[PDB]
Symmetry: C3
Subunit: 376 residues, 3 copies
């Protein structure tokens, strides 16, 4: 196992791009959606929780998510990266790069949750929640899907995190929105929301293409599919908005982008451009329907949770369809029918929703018993 410098280069750059999605991507996205008086506090919480995730990741997160253990968790053999030789290779890159790249995914996942809920949660309480949820939800789900655990062992397809990132975060956020969250504000800085959306989009190329772990033809496919699905989802959302509301809106265009990005996340390295266009259109329409329905059951920006949750599910299911060779995809594994793959996709979604929800509930409850959840 020797490291390829081209892959090393690509993966370090892709990691910087993923970090860019949180700092400042998601912070700016949310910053434009919440009340002016809450912006500073939310930015502080996203920055501090981001730092917290970075540290827990190196201390034990990477080891428990990616070390060899059982179907649910890794081990404690790589605490503070101990025993990982500097020149150790994982795939075609130095393991240290794999550590950073994987950690950047944990960061954006947590940023998605914190940015929306910062407004309603006590500072000490969000720190407690992050610790419980990163450890008991993000880590096991990452291990099960990308760390050789349960889901991977059953052949689940999730190229860049439709389950691990999107659904995982949407459920944790929706549990929080239900527990706390002001019950009934029109966005104050839409240019700021656009800037955040734009940064998320550009960073998402490192997120999606980088998930190939090498600058090969799959990274290239994922790159093209990201461009295509995002564009198709912007158009799908905007068309539905023109149709149902009479005109498009900036927030609709940005939400459409996120809908396509999320929808193509699990599918990007497995489908054809035709499948990416179809998924993007469906994701944008389902996202619009989603936020419309979520708002009919909801004073905090849950736009992202509705989009990430609904589009993540749609994307994860559609991956079980468009990965088929006959539809331009890379093909299912040997001896796997579309019917069987679809069943595995659904089981993976079900497990992610329940696991994340239960852990989130425990996290919010532990914080509430310890320091009190709701901001004083």
């Amino acid at each position: 196992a020797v490291a390829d410098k081209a892959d090393n280069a690509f993966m370090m750059i892709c990691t910087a791009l993923v970090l860019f999605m949180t700092i400042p991507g998601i912070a700016l996205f949310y910053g434009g959606l919440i009340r002016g008086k809450n912006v500073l506090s939310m930015l502080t919480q996203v920055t501090v929780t981001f730092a917290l995730v970075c540290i827990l990741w190196v201390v034990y997160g990477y080891s428990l998510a990616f070390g060899e253990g059982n179907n649910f968790f890794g081990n404690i053999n790589w605490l503070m990266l101990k025993n990982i030789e500097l020149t150790a290779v994982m795939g075609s890159i130095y393991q240290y790069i794999h550590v950073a790249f994987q950690g950047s995914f944990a960061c954006i996942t947590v940023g998605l949750i914190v940015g929306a809920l910062a407004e309603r949660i006590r500072f000490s309480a969000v720190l407690i929640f992050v610790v419980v949820w990163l450890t008991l939800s993000y880590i096991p789900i990452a291990h099960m899907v990308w760390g050789g655990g349960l889901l991977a062992s059953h052949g689940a397809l999730d190229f860049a995190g439709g389950t691990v990132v999107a659904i995982n975060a949407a459920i944790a956020g929706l549990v929080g929105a239900y527990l706390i969250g002001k019950r009934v504000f029109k966005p104050h800085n839409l240019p700021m929301v656009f800037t955040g959306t734009a940064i998320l989009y550009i960073g998402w190329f490192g997120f999606n293409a980088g998930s190939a772990g090498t600058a090969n033809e799959i990274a290239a496919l994922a790159f093209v599919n990201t461009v295509v699905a995002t564009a198709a989802a912007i158009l799908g959302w905007i068309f539905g908005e023109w149709a149902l509301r009479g005109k498009p809106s900036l927030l609709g265009a940005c939400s459409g982008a996120i809908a396509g990005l999320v929808g193509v996340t699990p599918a990007c390295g497995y489908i054809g451009v035709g499948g990416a266009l179809i998924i993007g259109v469906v994701a944008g329409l389902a996202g619009l329907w989603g936020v419309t329905m979520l708002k009919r059951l909801l004073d905090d920006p849950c736009d992202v949770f509705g989009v990430a949750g609904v589009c993540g599910i749609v994307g994860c299911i559609m991956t079980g369809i468009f990965a088929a060779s006959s539809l331009g995809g890379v093909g299912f594994a040997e001896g796997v029918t579309m019917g069987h793959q679809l069943l595995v996709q659904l089981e993976s979604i079900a497990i992610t929703i329940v696991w994340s929800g239960v852990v989130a509930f425990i996290g919010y409850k532990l914080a509430d018993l310890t320091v009190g959840l709701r901001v004083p």
Copy 2:
């Protein structure tokens, strides 16, 4: 033909950087120049038209611009990238990367036009215009210059798009400004203009260096020439402003940057650093003269069209001079004198101006007959 992973990596990153120039680069640049009340609508139009370009590109744009056809257009053999094997190599990179990279150029070209004119055009009308102009102007000009068409076949030199992007867009924009456009506002958010300028600048390294198609000594030369010409143009513009207006201005410094970037665009991979410094100085001064004169013939931000048009012409002509070995350039092709090259540069500029102007006129007119051009 085998793909080099280092080039694959470089080209995917350069593509993300070019996309960054539109989303959010150009949108922020224009967002700070137009009236506050028009910002949201302009951002929506840039985002939707960007999505539209992405989709038309994969559906048929790439095939018609880059497939083998005649001197003016390619073919319809690569519709939705059909027949392009995932592992197909173009140059030293996977063809899928070439598709994305080339598409990112079409995106910024359209963003340059839409951002300025969004204020004055009906939503449905800008969509119609983009469809007509991307198809009948961007595609043929890209084919003629970079797709083995007319201009390339005559040995025209245009490393990164002085004609295809800059002049092509400036003319389309100036035709629009003449047809519609409020006849006589001082920029409302100059920090926003600076941020957009900065993003355009950083993204321009992918635009210019990436045009080598490989991380070789030419990508390196283009990189250095981009740094040098941009700096020289900021200084040239600012000196002229200090001389004619008594002091420099933030808008002058940002316009100077764009002047150098545009001026070095066709020349970057063919000239020496000395030639880059000279082109940057001349471009910054010609840009200042340009906007001064355009404003004397002009209530919409035409700063970019004047700069892109004037600097694009200057850059394209000067490429026919500074490419000479005797002046530190890479050298003209075998049997080509500076006199002959200059003639080819001029013919390429003439053809681009007329072709883009006529098509633009047809696009605006078709929209006007269909849905009405001017915003209701």
Copy 3:
């Protein structure tokens, strides 16, 4: 000596990331800290001085910093890059890339100084100062540390510029703050400060990892150490702020990030992740103590000078400790004890402080005698 395309790619991308730290990173950071009425002028000064540095660098800076000369300066053999063949290789990359990469460091160094002091200095005076200081301070210090000069020849360890960039700039800035600078304002746009901090952070991966000059295991180590030290410093600063002020603040979180980034700068490619965590914690606490004390001796944003200066010193000293094999570092050179290395680190810090301070004083004084320092 043959160029490796993977390293070429990595280094050109890392250069774009370093340029991103100045344009617009540092400009936005400062833009949010100063009075609204001074923002435009400061942005103009940072942009023009950035251009000035780019030009002086290619004209003679690179040659005098990196050409072979004596212990203090290089030579004038590479004026305008003359005699540097396009295909010349330096390390494992084309020399042209080395030129651009090194120049980007000179740019951020100057941006750190100009952004803070622009408010209080005449336009013509900042240009004069930059010319004197870049030439007589930045160039010799770069030559002494990275150009085979005095410090390098004594085995000084400074991976990415704790001395050349951080301390060098902090001292020049503190001399300026003492000479000019309004004697006694609460930051007007903290979201802008955060955005600048975020851009500095992301760009810092090119700054730190790129300092390996190749996409190898050291670039990977530096990357991971950058993530770790920044996170640890955000937490260290925030904890001290919670402890001494009762709550964290957005400005404290951003300052903590910069404290970790600066602290790990000289150490990143030589220490273990454990050492990065320790340095980050210490840097964040020392930064907080630093600004607290500097403010007790100080109406201009000197936050950066206090942080860069104090954290740069801390980082440079700690590199002499954590580089030890026994502490997880890459190891000191053959025959060098920790005691000896610490002595060399201190001597390097002392020389940088005095050299930069004296030159800065001369620069400010020459400007004052020529055009008058204080803004009219």
